[PDB]
Amino acid sequence: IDLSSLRDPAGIFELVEVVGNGTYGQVYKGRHVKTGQLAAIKVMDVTEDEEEEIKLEINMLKKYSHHRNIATYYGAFIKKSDDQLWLVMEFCGAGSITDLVKNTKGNTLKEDWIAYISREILRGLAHLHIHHVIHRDIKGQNVLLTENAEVKLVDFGVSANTFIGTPYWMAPEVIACDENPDATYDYRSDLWSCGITAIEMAEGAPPLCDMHPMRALFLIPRNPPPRLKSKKWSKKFFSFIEGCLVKNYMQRPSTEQLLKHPFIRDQPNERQVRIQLKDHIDRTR
Ligand SMILES: Nc1ncnc2ccc(-c3ccnc(F)c3)nc12
Ligand SMILES: [Mg+2]
């Protein structure tokens, strides 16, 4: 891509309102002027400090979004002013996974809902990993739902920055310490994040949620793998969490291996779950 040849978004796209009020920063519910179809628009300022980082988010989202579990790239635009870069993509109108769990009774999702959502996350990750892309910011806030209960991944912003985000979904290997100065990691760091996301769906919050983020950052590399608090869950669900949450990434399974895990592989009530999720989205709307 080249920032020079990009057109002005006037009469093509318009901003409606910010989405998630700061969760994603300068991200808006947008509208394709001519059709009225919604789009999510990421608005970044084209500063010299953040100009190469800005181009890279365009290029990545552009080539790696042609998969049903990743929100699709539409186009890039520059609104000349300090110039404003607009990154336009597919709008997912039913909120994030975090929203879904906080707007549910008892801040807990049914196990078969967790199995459905976790598989869609892993299918999106398998697409990224096969194209040598690590998502790097897997969390319930970056996993969105559409009106018809489809699950899509967002944010190539930190994909492989001046502000470090939330640390709760971060794998031990991405947190630098004395025996890990270079914070050496691979695609498996997203699988740990997927495991924390499944705990988040089961409990309504990631482990260490009650800690100061800086304290969680210190604790993640030294604490044993997090575990589900309740004993109610199936053996397969406990086994899936254990798979995602292997402390040492060197023996953590691959995305392909986790997709074959009985909890992810065996979903007999798939059809009903999709209907239940749709019903939940409609009853919240
Ligand atoms: N596609 C979306 N539809 C609805 N709401 C959203 C909220 C955030 C992001 C988001 C967050 C961070 N970086 C992005 F590129 C997009 N994308 C969407
Ligand atoms: Mg797509």
From Swiss-Prot:
Residues given in the record as ATP binding sites: V19, G20, N21, G22, T23, Y24, G25, Q26, V27, K42
Compartment(s): Cytoplasm
Domain Protein kinase: 13-264
Domain of life of the native organism: Eukaryota
Tissue and organ distribution: Widely expressed. Isoform 5 is abundant in the brain. Isoform 4 is predominant in the liver, skeletal muscle and placenta.
Residues forming the catalytic site: D137 (proton acceptor)
Sequence similarity: Belongs to the protein kinase superfamily. STE Ser/Thr protein kinase family. STE20 subfamily.
UniProt function note: Serine/threonine kinase that plays a role in the response to environmental stress and cytokines such as TNF-alpha. Appears to act upstream of the JUN N-terminal pathway. Activator of the Hippo signaling pathway which plays a pivotal role in organ size control and tumor suppression by restricting proliferation and promoting apoptosis. MAP4Ks act in parallel to and are partially redundant with STK3/MST2 and STK4/MST2 in the phosphorylation and activation of LATS1/2, and establish MAP4Ks as components of the expanded Hippo pathway.
Assembly and binders: Interacts with the SH3 domain of the adapter proteins Nck. Interacts (via its CNH regulatory domain) with ATL1 (via the N-terminal region). Interacts with RAP2A (GTP-bound form preferentially).
Protein name as annotated: Mitogen-activated protein kinase kinase kinase kinase 4
Gene name for this UniProt entry: MAP4K4
